[PDB]
Amino acid sequence: GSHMNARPLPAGLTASQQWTLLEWIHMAGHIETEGELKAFLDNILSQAPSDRIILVLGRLNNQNQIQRMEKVLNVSYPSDWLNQYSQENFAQHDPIMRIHLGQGPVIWEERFSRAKGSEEKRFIAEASSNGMGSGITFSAASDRNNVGSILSIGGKEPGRNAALVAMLNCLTPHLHQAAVRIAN
Amino acid sequence: ARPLPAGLTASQQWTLLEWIHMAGHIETEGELKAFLDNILSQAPSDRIILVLGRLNNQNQIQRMEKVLNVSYPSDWLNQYSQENFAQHDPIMRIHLGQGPVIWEERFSRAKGSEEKRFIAEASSNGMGSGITFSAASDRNNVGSILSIGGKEPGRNAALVAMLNCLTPHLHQAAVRIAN
Numbered sequence: 001g002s003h004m005n006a007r008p009l010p011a012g013l014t015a016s017q018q019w020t021l022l023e024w025i026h027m028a029g030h031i032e033t034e035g036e037l038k039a040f041l042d043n044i045l046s047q048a049p050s051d052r053i054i055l056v057l058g059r060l061n062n063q064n065q066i067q068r069m070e071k072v073l074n075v076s077y078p079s080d081w082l083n084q085y086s087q088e089n090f091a092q093h094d095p096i097m098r099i100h101l102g103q104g105p106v107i108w109e110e111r112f113s114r115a116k117g118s119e120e121k122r123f124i125a126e127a128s129s130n131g132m133g134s135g136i137t138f139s140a141a142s143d144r145n146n147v148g149s150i151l152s153i154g155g156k157e158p159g160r161n162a163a164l165v166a167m168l169n170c171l172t173p174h175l176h177q178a179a180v181r182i183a184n
Numbered sequence: 185a186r187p188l189p190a191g192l193t194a195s196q197q198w199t200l201l202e203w204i205h206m207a208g209h210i211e212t213e214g215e216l217k218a219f220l221d222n223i224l225s226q227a228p229s230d231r232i233i234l235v236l237g238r239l240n241n242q243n244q245i246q247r248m249e250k251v252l253n254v255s256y257p258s259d260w261l262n263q264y265s266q267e268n269f270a271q272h273d274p275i276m277r278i279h280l281g282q283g284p285v286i287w288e289e290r291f292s293r294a295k296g297s298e299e300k301r302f303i304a305e306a307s308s309n310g311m312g313s314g315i316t317f318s319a320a321s322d323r324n325n326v327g328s329i330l331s332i333g334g335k336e337p338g339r340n341a342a343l344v345a346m347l348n349c350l351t352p353h354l355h356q357a358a359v360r361i362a363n
């Protein structure tokens with residue numbers, strides 16, 4: 001069952017990290033509103049003016065890719081970047097929108113380097129000029145409804161912190177269930 | 185959100201984290217039942233049920249939406265349902281979201297003659313002692329109780345604190361299954 005197939009918890013966390021992860025997952029399971037989700041992510045993840053954090057709940061295709069955004073839960077992507085992303089249909093050129101939700105974390109660099117299209121390259125240049133040339137995306141999908149969420153965090157630093165990556169990866173299914181409560 | 189329990193050992197904390205993590209992945213009724221039975225029947229002849237209900241304005245169950253039996257006796261559930269015991273059961277009067285309620289303590293404080301009649305009947309059916317955990321959500325519109333009948337309710341302080349902490353997550357799972 002889905003409870004048994006829950007992604008495995010991290011091995012080798014410090015006592016401090018284990019306690020933090022327990023706090024995070026316990027708290028996430030109480031989030032009922034957009035306001036609470038944003039405050040929670042601000043509280044546990046926000047670090048600096050240069051932060052780039054967003055959570056997106058989407059309707060999925062047969063490869064667990066987001067076909068339609070159901071709910072966008074912004075924390076620190078620039079307001080006008082989202083406008084531009086909508087206005088210029090970036091979802092069609094953004095390599096991160098092609099991820100198969102429910103796989104492990106995806107470092108942007110690995111997808112950005114494999115760009116072939118001039119237009120994909122243009123999007124990546126534009127993203128870079130907005131502080132989003134590097135980053136990491138965590139994901140989770142429900143088993144019994146075709147919805148899933150991605151948690152994106154900009155910058156090189158998060159992906160190089162092994163403990164944080166493992167912790168955020170385990171938190172992500174809980175953020176997804178929160179997003180589903182918020183969207184309902 | 186209720187606070188994490190203080191004073192757990194590292195292995196107890198890890199156990200609780202595993203349970204909350206697993207609970208947050210439950211999407212089906214079969215999954216919730218299997219989860220409760222496999223982890224909570226840590227016991228022998230302890231009797232376990234989860235009930236999801238709509239709440240009145242004092243956080244009491246006013247309508248049962250989902251009964252999720254684990255190990256309440258078939259016969260007791262038959263009797264309870266057939267004789268409308270929910271009316272007279274002091275455990276059904278809990279303000280959902282409060283800390284654990286030990287049945288003995290609640291039973292001794294019951295004044296109504298109907299209440300006292302129910303208690304005697306529960307006792308002769310092996311349902312005389314137990315503990316009930318609870319949680320409420322959605323602006324206190326709905327809530328669940330996790331009830332465990334058995335020998336000495338709150339003996340194992342760490343386990344009681346762990347189950348209290350887990351309960352809101354079991355409630356959210358029940359809500360997912362019932363909606």
Ligand SMILES: CCCCCCCCCC(=O)N[C@H]1CCOC1=O
Pocket residue numbers: 054056072082083085086094096097108127132133137152
């Ligand atoms: C109108 C709502 C737009 C919401 C856009 C959500 C995009 C999620 C995937 C993501 O993190 N892509 C990064 C990669 C570089 O630049 C981005 O933006």
Ligand SMILES: CCCCCCCCCC(=O)N[C@H]1CCOC1=O
Pocket residue numbers: 233235251261264265273275276287306311312316331332
């Ligand atoms: C429609 C009947 C099914 C609902 C039965 C659920 C009862 C939940 C409250 C509870 O745990 N009360 C204990 C107290 C003594 O004996 C019980 O049973």
